[PDB]
Each structure stands twice: as structure tokens, then as C-alpha cells.
Amino acid sequence: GGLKKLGKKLEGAGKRVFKASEKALPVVVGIKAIGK
Numbered sequence: 001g002g003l004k005k006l007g008k009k010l011e012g013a014g015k016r017v018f019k020a021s022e023k024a025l026p027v028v029v030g031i032k033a034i035g036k
Helices: 003-022 025-034
Strands: none
Touching: 003 025
């Protein structure tokens, strides 16, 4: 089954990248927090 293949592949990135995003959450939110 490829389903679990795609859901497990991309997921791997979101786990490592979470550090790249989490760090800019204040920088990604500030826009969503200002522009709502």
C-alpha cells in the first residue's frame, strides 16, 4: 500500500522541519496575529 507510504514519507519532513517552523512561529504568527 502506498497510502502509508505517502503519509509516512512527508510526515518525516514535518518532524524535522518543525524546528525550522516552530522557530518562526512568532514570525509566522505575528502575521496571522496582526492580520488575524
